[PDB]
Structures are given as structure tokens and as C-alpha cells.
Design a binder for these strands. Structure first.
Length: 88
RNA sequence: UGCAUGU
């Protein structure tokens, strides 16, 4: 064998507080700690209201999505959907 | 800024 059968890939992370960043998601998903990369969608005003993170393959990453999908932070529920990449 | 599948 020459390839990782379980490799992570990326994950849509919505309705987040507009004070969020890339390091904030990588640390907050970092409680579970399966992040390869992060990708906030950003505008000149703030976070644009969602990010992407590189995270999802195993059942523990599914469980982790299902936990942070409804996590109240700064008085706000995050909504962590699975992803397109990127055409639909 | 509450923009909704990508900086």
C-alpha cells in the first residue's frame, strides 16, 4: 500500500459569529483535533458568516460535525454541513 | 457585516 485509506477533506461551517477567524476554527475544531487546513470565506466587514475546514472522513469526524453543528459560541449556533467541492 | 457551499 502507498495511500492513506482514511484521509480528511473539507467541511462547510456556517452561521458563525462575525468575530471568528481561521485560527479560531482550527482551535475550536481543535478540541477534536483532525484539522489539516482552514478556510474562512471573509469580507472587508468580517467573516462573511461561514468558513470551510479540512476535517471530514472518519466516524469520529462525523461525530465531531454532529457535535459542533448546534454548538453555541458567542451566543450563536454554528451549522457544520458536509460539502460540495465546489461546483454543484 | 446575518452575505449562505469556499478566499
Amino acid at each position: 500500500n502507498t495511500e492513506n485509506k482514511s484521509q480528511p477533506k473539507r467541511l462547510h461551517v456556517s452561521n458563525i459569529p462575525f468575530r471568528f477567524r481561521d485560527p479560531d476554527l482550527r482551535q475550536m475544531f481543535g478540541q477534536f483535533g483532525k484539522i489539516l487546513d482552514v478556510e474562512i470565506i471573509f469580507n472587508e466587514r468580517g467573516s462573511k458568516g461561514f468558513g470551510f475546514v479540512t476535517f471530514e472522513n472518519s466516524a469520529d469526524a462525523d461525530r465531531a460535525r454532529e457535535k459542533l453543528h448546534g454548538t453555541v459560541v458567542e451566543g450563536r449556533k454554528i451549522e457544520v454541513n458536509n460539502a460540495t467541492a465546489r461546483v454543484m
